[PDB]
Ligand binder design. Structure first.
Ligand code: ACO
Length: 181
């Protein structure tokens, strides 16, 4: 397989992406799936594909939310039969260089804990907020640990976002060398 920039003019790659998003997050992607993928094709954003044979085995994107300095990692999906084989790691690393070249300094993302897959859920997050964030533990293979192993740190939490004790975990990473103090 090869990871490279997404052919934004390939109708098949786009359909494959639409299918991948609908099979992974059907609650977020539905009938207007094609229109949502077209938004991911916007010139200002970055679109990186992981392709093997005739399949889109993975995809990653980033939106410039704060000028060209603050990018959001959205989305990131690997085919179910292709996970835990480093595609995600290679895709995130590829995105980081894409962002850096465009003047980006940091990439952030938000990953919710809806299935009680982290110790940050089912607990009053306003109580010892940051002591809890620090002592976090993965209970159900929650993707937060993935980003953590890639250098992203939990920089914030949104308590009770998806209902009682179901927070949104905010993670970020500065991709370029700090100009010192
Ligand atoms: C931006 C958003 O929408 S949030 C992103 C959430 N994405 C999803 O849940 C979609 C479905 N999942 C996937 O696409 C993938 O499993 C990803 C993107 C979460 C990870 O990609 P993969 O290629 O499967 O993981 P990769 O092989 O790079 O794993 C790298 C390391 O992180 C670990 N890791 C990967 N996924 C997870 C996870 N869900 N939970 C815990 N650890 C994980 C791996 O075990 C490995 O650790 P090791 O080096 O100690 O062995």
């Amino acid at each position: 397989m090869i990871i490279s920039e997404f052919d934004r003019n390939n109708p098949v790659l786009k359909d494959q992406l639409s299918d991948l998003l609908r099979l992974t997050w059907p609650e977020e992607y539905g009938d207007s799936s094609a229109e949502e993928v077209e938004e991911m094709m916007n010139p200002e954003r970055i679109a990186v594909a992981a392709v093997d044979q005739d399949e889109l085995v993975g995809f990653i994107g980033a939106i410039p939310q704060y000028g060209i300095t603050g990018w959001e990692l959205h989305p990131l999906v690997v085919e179910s039969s292709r996970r835990k084989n480093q595609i995600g790691t290679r895709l995130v690393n590829y995105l980081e260089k894409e962002v850096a070249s465009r003047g980006g300094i940091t990439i952030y993302l938000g990953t919710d804990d809806l299935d009680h897959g982290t110790t940050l859920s089912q607990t009053d997050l306003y109580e010892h907020t940051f002591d809890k964030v620090a002592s976090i533990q993965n209970l159900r293979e929650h993707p937060y640990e993935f980003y953590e192993k890639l250098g992203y740190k939990i920089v914030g939490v949104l308590p009770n976002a998806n209902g009682w004790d179901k927070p949104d975990i905010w993670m970020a990473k500065t991709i370029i060398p700090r100009p010192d103090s």
